[PDB]
Amino acid sequence: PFRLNGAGASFPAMLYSNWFTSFSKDTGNKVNYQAVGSGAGVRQFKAKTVDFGASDGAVKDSKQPAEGMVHIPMTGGAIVPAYNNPGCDLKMTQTELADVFLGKIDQWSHFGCEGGVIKTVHRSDGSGTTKGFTNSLSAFSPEWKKTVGTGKSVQWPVGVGGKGNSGVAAGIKLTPGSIGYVNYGYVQNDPALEQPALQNKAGNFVKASAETASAGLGEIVLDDQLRGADANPAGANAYPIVSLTWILAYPEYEKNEAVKEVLRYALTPTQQGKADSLGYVPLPESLRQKALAAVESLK
DSSP states (O other): OOEEEEEEOSTTHHHHHHHHHHHHHHHSOEEEEEOOOHHHHHHHHHHTOSSEEEESSOOOGGGSOTTOOEEEEEEEEEEEOOEEOTTOOOEEOHHHHHHHHHTSOOBGGGGTOOSSBOEEEEESSOOHHHHHHHHHHHHHOHHHHHHTOOSSSOOOSSOEEESHHHHHHHHHHHSTTEEOOEETHHHHTOTTOBOOEEEOTTSOEEOOOHHHHHHHHTTOOOOTTSOOOOSSOOSTTOOSSEEEEEEEEOSSOTTHHHHHHHHHHHTSHHHHTTTGGGTOBOOOHHHHHHHHHHHHTOO
8 A cells, every 4th residue: 555645725725635535445545634734735736745736827848847747637626715794694705805805895794794804814825726717806806907917926015814715714713704715615615604696707697606606617727737717707697706726746756657647536426426515626637637648648
């Protein structure tokens, strides 16, 4: 039996943990995973201190290590504005969401709700979830794009930091009348957090679900390294804040037969089909096949 150690993105960590636990029960092999965020994942990948990395932001050619990297898309999902304000059924335009994170709207009464002051929560660590969320706020709001922009880290006008998707979710839960952003499983599978009906590019107010997240993800056009994003997808029923997420593999590596075994396992329809229960969208069949071919390309 082998051991592997991977690190990176917390966005898919619910699903990766499930897969790795299942793989251990079924095979005896152990695959440990550190949800340190995409920032740290890419750093440790580059430093060769892990068997594989993980990021929700694809790595452009100029930032890839000389020895190369293979992106293997594993899943996708909504990034939602999770909030803690019982009794408030929050509905938000794209401008309003951005204006809440700019500090321009700080009263729950703006949305017709009780709760007093709106407190925001954001990531303290370099984050692919931040990248996606801020990519969307930048598309939603010229003011956001100009004054804050998008990246794994940004300068937040207001709010408190939390570490990982888990720390953001915890901060929202701990602070009455707060809002942040997290992978959807933290909302779907927690009765204390809710999500807003959020305006999409088409003008419809939608909540994240299998239907709306898959609709949004389906608009993403990938390059020949399976990289791509869409900050604000078109379509009547698209959820507007969605991201893919990738495992980062070395093209040639002494333990890649073991890496290949676990990725093949994670890419079966049986493992993939767990995605929805944990707040993710399984790869469409054509992308699953592209992922498997990428896995098989490893040496």
